[PDB]
Amino acid sequence: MSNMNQTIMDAFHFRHATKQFDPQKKVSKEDFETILESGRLSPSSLGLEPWKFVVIQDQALRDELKAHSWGAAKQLDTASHFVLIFARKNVTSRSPYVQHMLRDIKKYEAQTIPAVEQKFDAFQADFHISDNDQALYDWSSKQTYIALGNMMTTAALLGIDSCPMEGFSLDTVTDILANKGILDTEQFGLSVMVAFGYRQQDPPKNKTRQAYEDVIEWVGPKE
Amino acid sequence: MSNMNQTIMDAFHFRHATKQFDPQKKVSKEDFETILESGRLSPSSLGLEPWKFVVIQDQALRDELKAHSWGAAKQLDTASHFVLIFARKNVTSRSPYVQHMLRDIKKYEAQTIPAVEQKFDAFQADFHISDNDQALYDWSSKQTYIALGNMMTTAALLGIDSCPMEGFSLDTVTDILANKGILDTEQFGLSVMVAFGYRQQDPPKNKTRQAYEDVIEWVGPKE
């Protein structure tokens, strides 16, 4: 595929921040698996995959979220699939989660794990990740935006629209999910929302972005 | 139709955190412009595009960064193309850049810009973005990781290897770039690095991730 360039650019122009989805058109089991897999397979710093993807197909739960998710209301009402992306708190060489990742998932040699912890500690200080709990949590949250971008792009390539959403009352929504047993606020926070479905109509406004020369700069030979 | 699922899946298995690129294989200009466009066309919260992509092809500058970039050393030595992604500081409704984005790029109606500004404030308060300067910066940094994921996936769809990199001494690399007049530390921070090229060999270790059941949960009917 030498036209893969055109294929990719088509998808980045197809994707927009869809508010209104067609309530009749559902994303197939197979397509949504692909979308979910693109989050699961995403890269993450240290390979620590500090995320959870919660598919909220329950209408009454969506409605509860809508009342406190001003920026998500129409997407909650109409999206075929709606995804909460959690980010892990306290992702340190200390945590039981990280020990599980190194020993059980990544398959590190057990005798090296004390030294890897120290290396992790030093990186986190050298990058200011471990300055405070907010920085430590926001670092894991940055990794979930990698998966967020990958999921929307994968959806676009399949002809499926999406919408990322930060427009919700974080404290209130966190409390709703915590009291429902869905969000373990000791291990996670709610990082960002994303919706999937088929548009009801083409976007009435044109995509706007800054000019190439205002966001891109070369230092050295350009070719 | 559904040839595309497997193609997407192939690319997400093709991409890996490449440490050594083939120093004789260069990404084409056409292919790199597609990669760059995937960053420029990435979505961002409020459409504020709070990023800059700086391509460091100067090998002398690469070598200086390398001296304080433990996680990027081989990639700086060998990558065809090496990008620094900057994240903007102080992205609030009062800032000059946001004013530019509202009036010049998004071309909001002048008379109602007060209402736009006021919802920005409310939203940033509701999401704790404006709790402090650290939160404000890291929120913008979160947006750059969308562009990061998109550029790595785009490259992979093109058969091009990539590697994202946080493994550098934040403060020291910031001063180097600042002293050279590449990084204006009052407008930007150095968010993340990303390298592009062609693998020197197939990765020896199989890609590992948590199982689907461990990171994905459905609330409501599945299908």
Ligand SMILES: Cc1cc2c(cc1C)N(C[C@H](O)[C@H](O)[C@H](O)COP(=O)(O)O)c1[nH]c(=O)[nH]c(=O)c1N2
């Ligand atoms: C992390 C994040 C969070 C949000 C958004 C984006 C991103 C990346 N944007 C969508 C934003 O307004 C939109 O992407 C851009 O303004 C317009 O560019 P596009 O239409 O996507 O090309 C968004 N849109 C919306 O209707 N409700 C919301 O709560 C949000 N929040």
Ligand SMILES: Cc1cc2c(cc1C)N(C[C@H](O)[C@H](O)[C@H](O)COP(=O)(O)O)c1[nH]c(=O)[nH]c(=O)c1N2
């Ligand atoms: C934001 C971010 C930052 C980094 C990374 C990734 C991400 C997403 N990873 C690579 C990371 O270790 C790798 O993606 C996963 O651990 C392994 O899975 P993959 O090979 O990518 O599929 C990485 N790799 C490296 O050689 N030097 C580095 O400084 C970093 N830093």
